[PDB]
Amino acid sequence: IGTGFPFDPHYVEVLGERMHYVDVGPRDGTPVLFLHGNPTSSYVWRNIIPHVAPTHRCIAPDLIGMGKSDKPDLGYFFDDHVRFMDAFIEALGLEEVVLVIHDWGSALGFHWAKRNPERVKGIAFMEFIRPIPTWDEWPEFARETFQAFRTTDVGRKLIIDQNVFIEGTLPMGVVRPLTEVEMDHYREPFLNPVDREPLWRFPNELPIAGEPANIVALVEEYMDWLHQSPVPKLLFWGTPGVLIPPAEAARLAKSLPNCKAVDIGPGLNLLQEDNPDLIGSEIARWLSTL
Numbered sequence: 001i002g003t004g005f006p007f008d009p010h011y012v013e014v015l016g017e018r019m020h021y022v023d024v025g026p027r028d029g030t031p032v033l034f035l036h037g038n039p040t041s042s043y044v045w046r047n048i049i050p051h052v053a054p055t056h057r058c059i060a061p062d063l064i065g066m067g068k069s070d071k072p073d074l075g076y077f078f079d080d081h082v083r084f085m086d087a088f089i090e091a092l093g094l095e096e097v098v099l100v101i102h103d104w105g106s107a108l109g110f111h112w113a114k115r116n117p118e119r120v121k122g123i124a125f126m127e128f129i130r131p132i133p134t135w136d137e138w139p140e141f142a143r144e145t146f147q148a149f150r151t152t153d154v155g156r157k158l159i160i161d162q163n164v165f166i167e168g169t170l171p172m173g174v175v176r177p178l179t180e181v182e183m184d185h186y187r188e189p190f191l192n193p194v195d196r197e198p199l200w201r202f203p204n205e206l207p208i209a210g211e212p213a214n215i216v217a218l219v220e221e222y223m224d225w226l227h228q229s230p231v232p233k234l235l236f237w238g239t240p241g242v243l244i245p246p247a248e249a250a251r252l253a254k255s256l257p258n259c260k261a262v263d264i265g266p267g268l269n270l271l272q273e274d275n276p277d278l279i280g281s282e283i284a285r286w287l288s289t290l
């Protein structure tokens with residue numbers, strides 16, 4: 001699995017802040033927009049993009065405050081990410097798109113799709129954000145960790161001071177052993193502790209046990225939209241997973257309209273790091289059927 005990031009930097013001014021993005025492939029079709037989550041960047045798509053780039057334009061932004069994008073003084077609430085991603089999409093003059101989304105990137109993607117349904121021609125997704133009614137519906141072995149994350153004193157000591165989301169949570173979400181070189185790519189944006197705000201706010205925005213109520217409502221709304229939409233859907237899943245267990249993936253494949261599910265093999269949260277070639281090749285094949 002490739003550790004390099006052989007992509008020229010592209011930058012666009014978005015609400016007065018510079019955002020970085022990968023942009024490769026031809027301008028003669030429908031672009032494919034790749035959205036990463038927490039605590040990753042466009043680096044997470046590095047081995048998937050090469051399967052798609054020969055036939056379709058691949059656009060992979062770094063969320064505001066992450067990757068090579070600027071780091072404004074924000075709270076980095078989901079509202080901030082929604083605002084900046086909305087403006088990113090408009091700054092690139094995108095019309096219709098295909099979405100490839102993961103983790104907090106899936107919340108952005110589904111929320112954008114709900115509000116712009118005529119402009120989404122397909123959604124590939126994996127390990128995505130859905131409402132978590134109670135802490136019993138959160139993964140058993142990550143309950144104590146994320147409960148600790150969702151506090152001001154303990155959570156910030158862990159995530160901001162000790163950088164545990166990068167040093168611990170990230171590699172623990174990959175079944176195979178992430179290499180030092182790969183870890184260093186993921187570490188790059190957060191070498192300064194003050195820049196780790198998004199890493200702590202994100203888990204505090206997760207819709208768990210009815211809080212934060214506004215996120216729970218937003219996520220419920222786009223899940224309702226997804227269940228009602230005829231848009232082509234491609235769901236990647238792994239065993240045992242984290243956000244999406246195998247049993248949930250099978251249920252979603254039946255319940256969501258026009259949905260194909262693909263087993264990547266062993267996987268936790270960062271499925272892209274465990275089977276990029278299958279994810280890439282299947283997206284490429286799926287795109288040709290659209």
Ligand SMILES: [Cl-]
Binds near residue numbers: 202203204206
């Ligand atoms: Cl998170």
